[PDB]
Write a protein that binds this ligand. Structure first.
Ligand SMILES: *CCC(=O)N1CCN(Cc2ccc(F)cc2)CC1
Ligand SMILES: *CCC(=O)N1CCN(Cc2ccc(F)cc2)CC1
Lengths: 304, 304
């Protein structure tokens, strides 16, 4: 037992990390097959970021201007092209360490692991969630752009995120592997404020089920509620409204613990209205929302 | 910016994970060079764990009785021996994926990454701290024994932990890579209660410095304190007493932020005596103690 914010093993992603340099700017790239994926702002100078015309800037660039280094070995660039906000650099060698992979665009409320990188070298790994307002709350310093988010299904890596920027608010924004930003964010150094970030209700409930499984039961009560009644409370406390689909994904956890989804909603309702009263749940003093129902099942069963 | 419970990239450790089977019991092993390291209770049947005589049990075992599988390939066992609570199985092949490594015995209050494994396959990675009472608060299900804790210094993996057991309290105990348990724990299914777990004071202060660096400054106050005055408060709240050595390791963070170590102690004192008043620090509603001063510097500078 025990419950931790657990990341996927980062090994398959580490072997794909490269360093991409264009002029004075250096950031991370993702090498899969004979292609290196990186944020298009690698062609920008800090000055350009106020309002870059990426098409005009990329015209001044040739294959030899993109230096791609994998550890200590230089990759030869035979092609370059821009797809939305990412650059695709075709190299002459397929990555021998390319794992089975997919490029997927995750839904808000879903979770993923981030392998933070600097100069193409990995520094650490952590679990993240795509917030409902399409930002992530990561840990990224200068040179971390190009670091990727992923999920792993046995041997297949599903890449879902590429880090592009930190907003003036300290929150993070980026793209899927097709170069499309999550949310309304643009790859420009401008005033960009994230919308109201709601709490992911289905993840809080799934984490409450995880607490019941692992011993923490103080928050359970003699009450029940309905989807409409719970949602009045969820709206007051800036929680996502719960749907029948959310109820259904909670099915496995409801069945294992024997606590009805609406009964757990009544426990959540009382915690929202009364707080924790100085108590903790799974070592946290607040309601955790970065564990999906799938994450809880996986951790409580030991899927490798 | 941003601050996360970040684990080391687990790649170098993934390539060392194997599956060790002895009779009906299967757990994880660590393959470095021509040796496989695993918990000695792999020779036990669930019945034996009440009071196992490991020397007597190991006499009934031969090299052919230890089945060691690395993914899909079987390793040939040419030697076996027990060193404290770990078994060392000499195999006929050096692990081609062995990284540069050390075996180190960490101090209480230090942190490490755990690569949780089942049947020799990695499921996830998380950051842990060796508690002052020598237990860890992990996430381990049946079949996770043999999973290891480590730290990484550029290319050298320092293994510090091997998981051996969950106490009836749900907390975890294990050994260093020489088979010596951290704390008073024995590899036996008996009543074993961890001592009083104190909060790691130097890590809370280092995490407070991390909050100041990353924007959260509400907790800073117009007060200061002394080592003796602070320690009266730390003793009341079951915090480790602060020493001049703790003050000195906080030197880099004190210098970067310009906030004197004793001034930050006065902020910590007020948080202990008054709580958070419903506020948060780095997304946490309690005082985090699983980030060492070294972890904070590393994350705030981007060491790969
Ligand atoms: C790779 C993008 C990223 O996360 N960082 C690089 C730039 N950093 C500074 C920054 C912060 C906020 C801004 F509005 C612009 C630049 C932060 C880390
Ligand atoms: C590898 C040891 C471990 O963490 N586990 C295996 C046994 N599990 C059950 C257990 C719990 C508490 C006990 F006192 C004995 C056995 C938990 C996970």
């Amino acid at each position: 037992s025990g419950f931790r914010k657990m990341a996927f093993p980062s090994g398959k992603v580490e072997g794909c990390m490269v360093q991409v340099t264009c002029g004075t700017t250096t950031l991370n790239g993702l090498w899969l097959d004979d292609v290196v994926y990186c944020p298009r702002h690698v062609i920008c100078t800090s000055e350009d970021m106020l309002n870059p015309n990426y098409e005009d800037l990329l015209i001044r660039k040739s294959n030899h201007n993109f230096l791609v280094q994998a550890g200590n070995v230089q990759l030869r660039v035979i092609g370059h092209s821009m797809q939305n906000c990412v650059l695709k650099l075709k190299v002459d060698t397929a990555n021998p360490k390319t794992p089975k992979y997919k490029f997927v665009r995750i839904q808000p409320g879903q979770t993923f692991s981030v392998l933070a990188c600097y100069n193409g070298s990995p520094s650490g790994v952590y679990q993240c969630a795509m917030r409902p307002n399409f930002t992530i709350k990561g840990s990224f310093l200068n040179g971390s752009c190009g670091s990727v988010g992923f999920n792993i299904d046995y041997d297949c890596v599903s890449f879902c995120y590429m880090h592009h920027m930190e907003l003036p608010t300290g929150v993070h924004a980026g793209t899927d592997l097709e170069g499309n930003f999550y949310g309304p964010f643009v790859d420009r150094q401008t005033a960009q404020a994230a919308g109201t970030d709601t709490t992911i209700t289905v993840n809080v409930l799934a984490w409450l089920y995880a607490a019941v499984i692992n011993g923490d039961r103080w928050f359970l009560n003699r009450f029940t509620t309905t989807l409409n009644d719970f949602n009045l409370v969820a709206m007051k406390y800036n929680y996502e409204p719960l749907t029948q689909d959310h109820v259904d994904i909670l099915g496995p956890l409801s069945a294992q613990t024997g606590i009805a989804v609406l009964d757990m909603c009544a426990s959540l309702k009382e915690l929202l209205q009364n707080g924790m009263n100085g108590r903790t749940i799974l070592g946290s003093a607040l309601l955790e929302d970065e564990f999906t129902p799938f994450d809880v099942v996986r951790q409580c069963s030991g899927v490798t």
